[PDB]
């Protein structure tokens, strides 16, 4: 058994998906027309749009993952038994699983990127060394009720999310707690995957409802439940994702429980392979 997993924000990098664009020139052209710019140039030319700006990152990641998948499947002959993606990457898993088509995913992640891109006054930080239980305790003991858990990445990598000044207060807390190895603020200015994504979540819910969704060929493990998408709640499970924890350690657990399980990371970088190794350890 094998699982294809799709990376999210932080895996992009100029040169990503080099040579795959002209191989799927229809998809590239379709992406160009939906986006209003050259998706090949976003991905691979240092002279054009900065791929690190979330509004562009998500379409860049989404297109590169999509195409990397089509190539893998063509090349191995094998379609995966499960699919999962981290935050942005979930949209590649639903799409590979047949929930919607290339175009539909890209429209979705364009609006995702744009809405995420206007979020302001926020901050996220990775805390390494403590459990999600432990992070929760400390947050509260120290009266930081404003910070949410945005990412459960390994059993001891937790990303926190809140107002900018709140992330700064927590620095002092986490860097003076036993078992914390690292506090590393993320290079973002929105409190993603937290209560502060509320209005954006909604605006984005209404957008999701506007599309017709197909049934899944592959089981997709949801970021929100660490469980497979229940086929009747597809839109609801996806719309719940914006302002809820990415439950990634547990989504990788569920897949290990499924049998003798292989993971392959489709898309740029080895970020998820990393998290999978540490979850497996
Ligand atoms: Cl079983």
């Amino acid at each position: 058994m094998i699982t294809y997993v799709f990376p999210g924000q932080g895996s992009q990098q100029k040169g990503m998906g080099q040579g795959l664009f002209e191989q799927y020139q229809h998809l590239t052209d379709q992406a160009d027309q939906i986006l209003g710019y050259s998706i090949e140039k976003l991905c691979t030319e240092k002279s054009y749009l900065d791929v690190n700006h979330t509004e562009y990152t998500q379409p860049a990641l989404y297109v590169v993952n999509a195409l990397s998948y089509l190539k893998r499947v063509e090349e191995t002959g094998r379609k995966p038994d499960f699919a999962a993606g981290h935050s942005l990457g979930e949209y590649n898993a639903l799409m590979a699983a047949g929930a919607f088509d290339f175009e539909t995913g890209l429209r979705l992640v364009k609006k995702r990127g744009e809405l995420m891109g206007r979020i302001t006054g926020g901050g996220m930080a990775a805390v390494i060394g403590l459990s999600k239980e432990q992070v929760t305790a400390v947050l509260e003991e120290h009266r930081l009720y404003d910070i949410d858990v945005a990412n459960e990445n390994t059993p001891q990598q937790i990303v926190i999310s809140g107002p900018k000044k709140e992330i700064e207060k927590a620095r002092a807390v986490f860097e003076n707690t036993k078992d914390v190895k690292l506090f590393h603020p993320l290079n973002v200015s929105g409190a993603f995957h937290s209560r502060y994504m509320n209005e954006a979540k909604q605006v984005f819910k209404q957008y999701i409802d506007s599309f017709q969704f197909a049934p899944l060929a592959i089981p997709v493990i949801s970021n929100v439940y660490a469980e497979p998408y229940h086929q009747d709640r597809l839109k609801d499970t996806l719309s719940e994702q914006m302002d809820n924890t990415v439950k990634w350690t547990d989504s990788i657990r569920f897949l290990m429980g499924r049998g003798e399980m292989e993971f392959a990371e489709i898309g740029p970088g080895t970020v998820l392979t990393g998290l999978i190794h540490r979850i497996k350890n």
Side-chain angles (χ1 to χ4, degrees), residues 1-45 47-78 80-164 166-177 179-198 200-232 234-276 279 281:
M1 283 201 312
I2 199 174
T3 296
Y4 286 5
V5 293
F6 295 101
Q9 181 89 34
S11 294
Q12 75 281 356
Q13 168 215 244
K14 279 283 179 170
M16 67 193 293
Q18 172 68 45
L20 265 40
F21 299 94
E22 62 268 32
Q23 281 200 230
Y24 301 85
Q25 198 51 232
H26 274 270
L27 296 194
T28 290
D29 285 3
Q30 278 177 237
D32 278 13
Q33 289 170 262
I34 285 149
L35 299 160
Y37 56 78
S38 167
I39 185 66
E40 196 168 331
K41 267 153 184 172
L42 169 63
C43 288
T44 68
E45 306 295 298
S47 260
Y48 298 72
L49 302 179
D50 161 25
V51 72
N52 292 314
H53 272 289
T54 194
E55 314 111 75
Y56 305 145
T57 309
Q58 310 202 208
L61 278 169
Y62 178 77
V63 172
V64 167
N65 294 6
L67 294 197
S68 294
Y69 174 79
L70 300 171
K71 201 56 175 69
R72 191 55 61 75
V73 163
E74 153 154 352
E75 222 168 50
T76 58
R78 210 236 159 109
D81 301 307
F82 301 88
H86 191 295
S87 194
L88 191 272
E90 177 144 317
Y91 285 85
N92 280 110
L94 294 171
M95 123 90 201
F100 39 74
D101 48 50
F102 180 76
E103 279 205 351
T104 317
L106 190 62
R107 293 204 160 85
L108 289 176
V109 316
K110 203 189 186 277
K111 188 106 190 234
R112 192 166 185 275
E114 159 188 348
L115 297 171
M116 256 142 143
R118 25 216 39 155
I119 317 278
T120 217
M124 294 172 81
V127 181
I128 283 127
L130 306 181
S131 52
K132 129 73 152 147
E133 185 256 316
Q134 270 162 338
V135 164
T136 275
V138 163
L139 284 179
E140 288 171 40
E141 285 154 338
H142 284 75
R143 321 282 151 117
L144 294 150
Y145 304 123
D146 290 342
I147 293 164
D148 291 302
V149 178
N151 277 10
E152 292 172 0
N153 282 340
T154 84
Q156 68 156 57
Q157 314 196 353
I158 300 302
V159 179
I160 63 203
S161 205
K164 194 61 170 181
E166 254 37 60
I167 285 312
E168 298 160 340
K169 297 179 177 87
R171 186 165 193 129
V173 183
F174 288 99
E175 291 182 348
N176 292 287
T177 300
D179 290 336
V180 169
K181 317 318 274 175
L182 202 195
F183 191 88
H184 182 59
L186 300 194
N187 202 342
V188 302
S189 52
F192 307 135
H193 291 295
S194 70
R195 75 194 76 170
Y196 310 95
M197 295 304 280
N198 224 313
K201 172 268 199 61
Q202 249 118 84
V203 182
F204 195 68
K205 174 158 196 196
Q206 293 170 62
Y207 201 58
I208 285 162
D209 298 346
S210 78
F211 298 90
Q212 76 143 216
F213 277 16
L216 311 187
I218 323 292
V220 177
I221 313 296
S222 72
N223 272 0
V224 165
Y225 309 106
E227 271 182 23
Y229 266 88
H230 313 318
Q231 211 84 45
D232 25 297
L234 292 181
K235 290 179 183 188
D236 272 2
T237 286
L238 181 64
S239 87
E240 283 284 40
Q241 188 223 54
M242 187 163 293
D243 62 344
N244 279 292
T245 308
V246 174
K247 286 176 96 67
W248 188 252
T249 110
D250 281 349
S251 311
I252 295 301
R253 282 230 207 91
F254 176 88
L255 295 171
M256 280 149 71
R258 216 75 345 222
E260 173 75 324
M261 183 65 76
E262 208 207 317
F263 296 83
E265 178 165 18
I266 316 302
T270 73
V271 170
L272 304 187
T273 301
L275 304 171
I276 283 153
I279 300 157
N281 283 351

